[model samples]
Target: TKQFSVPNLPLNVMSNSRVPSLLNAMVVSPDQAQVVQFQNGRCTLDGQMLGTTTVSASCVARFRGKTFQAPDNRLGINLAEISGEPYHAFESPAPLGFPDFGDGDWHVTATKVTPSQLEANDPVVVGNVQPYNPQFAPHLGTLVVENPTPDQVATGTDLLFNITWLSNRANNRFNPWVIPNYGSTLTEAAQLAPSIFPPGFGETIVYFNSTFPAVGATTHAAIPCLLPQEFVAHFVNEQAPIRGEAALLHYIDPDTHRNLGEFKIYPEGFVTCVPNVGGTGPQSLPTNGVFVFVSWVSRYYQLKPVGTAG
Candidate 1:
């Protein structure tokens, strides 16, 4: 077998910034390559035979409180200062095989992610986090997401991420996450119950494990946003909501004060003037109180087999 080396984390950052939860690599059979040691910020990929072998490595880490970030390999960062940076280390798809035939091929992939605070849910849409596709309106601030895993559709499979929406005193928005038990159908009316304005929500989850289904059933994670009209107007021409993403909510009338209109309240994203329900169809209720219904990939290798060489 042969041994390969792992690179070091970038310097000049916090020493404890790169505390990777684990690093793993696997060599496809016959060549019998695998990662046998990963410690002290080091990794080794070993293989046998002169033929080209295949090895896949994955890494997981934590920054906030729990779990890894989604989007495969990422260096989670704020525009100027990221709690921790999500990084990607990739081995060339054409890894150089040293001893001719035995050294078949190889490449590297690096992934780094940091947990986010619940407050990330409310960071003003225009600047904080960026969406993978700016064309689409993002519901969540900056987030990490990826196409589904092997043999899976573009939608995500079992990826995971942490989404937080802290309470805001001014906007009065509390827990951007929602979890209402829709007994029968999931209609706008159901959400409109309790007026959908003065509402409280949390720990909401997207669907899971399915096949050939709508994106909702696909369970892929999508980061939504509320960019300014100037930022988005140029991208879309009112054709359709980008990424089916749109308008956002930060704080709501947490206390149902019914006194929000007296004060000039503005929406974090776009105004909701769809001629829908707002007491008078004006921009008072809907615009002042936004209700964002969204689902996303919110998990990582909950399975023990995560990071293993199958």
Candidate 2:
């Protein structure tokens, strides 16, 4: 029950008008100048329904002059009126008002709403406008295995691939900036040998130096089936080497073989990791070391494995 595809929507409409006896004679003439009439509305796209039309309105005039010492020196005069000839753009079973100078004139209409028909309902004059949800937030690529558990090869011995950039709220956590060169650490991330992966590349994958331990367990209290470190990966190259690519590895509940953290990549998708490390040296340790998180999912697109759970 996970089939998806549908995204492309657009709609726009505009119209406005106002004129009260030249705005109450420019609010009681100061030197004699008052004229109000502005109607310049016409804009349509994907206009769902409407026919028979010739609607165009525009006008503006304001004048008040008596500059003696200061204040009340307003001057703005621009006018052009054209009404009488073709009107009816549909939808009007009663809801129209404006006309009294010679008696009759005021018309405009624009409507366009489409985005799966406004996502199936919510368009009574654009209700806050909304429609765009592509759902995808789980990235940290390249970590395939056909069976490797001796504590994942003694904590990824020299780390060849244990990438994971997943996130749905660990309170926004992922931080791996790239910093390692003392005694080989980030061990698994390959394919950079096309004379050094780049320029119409082919074999490209890097980030070598690794370590992982201290992910879940040590709950001195707080245990309800104890399992919180969700995992899933598959995002190859969405752009800019953008790193964080996935292919294989499925564990939603394989008897809880916990510990889902580690990434390296490094090229354009630049990624490095270290989370909750266990102690040994480095000040009673236990913060591990590499941490870099930015993808709530979406560097562009790439994740497809459609079936696997055992």
Candidate 3:
């Protein structure tokens, strides 16, 4: 492939502060390519790691160039693991985004932003300046449920179904990551139950998987069974009244595993399960007053009577 070099963690600051920043890069490939190598106060890329920074003249340490090829190079970064200093990194299609030079190198540089040279409103510049399209990102189209019509669902029935949606061809031919709305039940209705959200409400996961029928073409996927009572009983204490909104169609990147976008399914496709005469016992009662779903993503759900289902 080709070789390219760019700053790993480039940043612009408004204040005079120096923070510890970690520079890293990953090779998205199966073959051999040049990678960065860091050693005692020095860095190297695509060559031998055989240099060290030494003091020059009055009092300054200078960096030298070195390189090497990383054989096992399917490297990646988990942003959550990073400690101290805030930084942002972008990938493909955007200028200043992750540069995909098959043989690529990235590293961190600790440089202080000088305030005396810049005015309050002045923007600081760094790295090779280039124009990039901010709008070059993924977009999701309308999501449609294809099977097990909403109203036809009954309590205790296995939730098996499928759906179709317009695909954004620009996202490449990666598998579409689909998330179910059953999890939405955990968040959407909490105010009604408050701290007493039902137990095992978060345990039942139904119809989970991603598919890629094609880009620009309507993508269809089959969802396997997840019992409905596992989710529905959370709203009522006993065979009580309840109503449910439709679940959301959540999407994420197949590679980076980051949320790309989401769209709520049609209201006509909402799923609900009627509570039995005595409820699902402990499964139906809130445990330890912990609203995990509500604490994460809750709505103003108010509890009501059982006959309301009619």
Candidate 4:
């Protein structure tokens, strides 16, 4: 079976809501699935779930501040990988791309992140941008912009300290962002592509992961695994090689309920290589990379592939 309807869908072209009533002027969907429907403001999809894994309409909006979510298998791998994951816009949220929406702009989510799980209007993906090297940085988004220059907006606001070798985490390929593959529902070319989303910039899908759950992983010790109460964080990359070590992230003031800070991590050294391909350069030396430890999120931050194994 197949059905559809998209008529006059406009909340007035918006997605980066600082105040359009912090969103939800109407952008709903998530009975999970079984065909679909929203109404008056328009949104619908047909049935039979469709061929193979991908399903659902996916659209939910709300933000008056404090938001986050991610923590499922925390990436050990399975069907690629998934965690907390949030941030969405049914028809508009604004901004556009390359880690350039929401504070800190990408000084690693805005200056040395550290918050251990929290939420409100729900906005997630606090850094998991993918990089186990499925052909290097497979375009997962929560903040990892590497535009090798031509003065892209003054190198994207100098991304605070020229961002040493442009950030990394390693491994997880093909997210398809929110691939429905068009009309049955949801489109602007599935998720906007007007020359890669520019003009008033409203494809808006930045740092959007928030499934919800917090604190896990023992051994080699590092803590703080949940956040909110003011967000924005980025680890190290100035001279490359520091993988969220020292780990003890923070933030939770909800107005003087304080837990301010105590998780120190100077992390930035996790560079592993061999046949890891830099193709003929000191045999790709940089072996002690990602040698890490964490008892400090101090703030925060996945997987992959066919034709390979552990």
lDDT of each: 0.19, 0.17, 0.19, 0.19
lDDT of 3 by residue, 1-310 (tens): 2221111111111100001111111001112131221111121122111111111111111111111111232111111101212222221111111111111111222111234433463222111101122211111101111121121222222111111222333444212222111111222211111111111222111121122222332223211111111121222212221123423333233445443222221122111222223333112221111111111111222222111211
State the lDDT of candidate 1 residue by residue for 186-219, as single tens digits. Answer: 2342121121121112111110011111122111
Give a tens-digit lDDT track for model 2, residues 1-310. 2211111110001111111111000000112121211111111111111111112112211111111111122111111112222212122210112111111111111111234444563222101000011110001111112212221121211211111211111343222211111111222321111111221112112121122211221211111100001100011111122223321221122234332332222222222222222311111212222222323333223322111221
**Alpha-carbon error at 144 in model 2, in Å?**
39
TM-score of 4: 0.17
Candidate 3 stretches with Cα past 4 Å from truth are 1-164, 174-220, 223-310
Clashes of each: 41, 32, 9, 59
- lDDT (Cα) of model 4: 0.19
Best by TM-score: 4
Model 1 stretches with alpha carbons more than 4 Å out:
1-224, 228-269, 276-310
Residue 202 lDDT in candidate 3: 24
Q: Model 4, 246-296: lDDT tens per residue?
A: 233222233454432222222211111111122221112221111112233
Candidate RMSDs in order: 27.1, 33.7, 26.8, 25.6
TM-score for predicted model 3 compared with the true structure? 0.14
Q: What TM-score fits each model?
A: 0.15, 0.13, 0.14, 0.17
Candidate 2's C-alpha runs over 4 A off are: 1-259, 262-271, 275-310
Stretches of candidate 4 off by over 4 Å are 1-69, 72-88, 92-94, 97-107, 111-128, 131-186, 189-191, 195-310
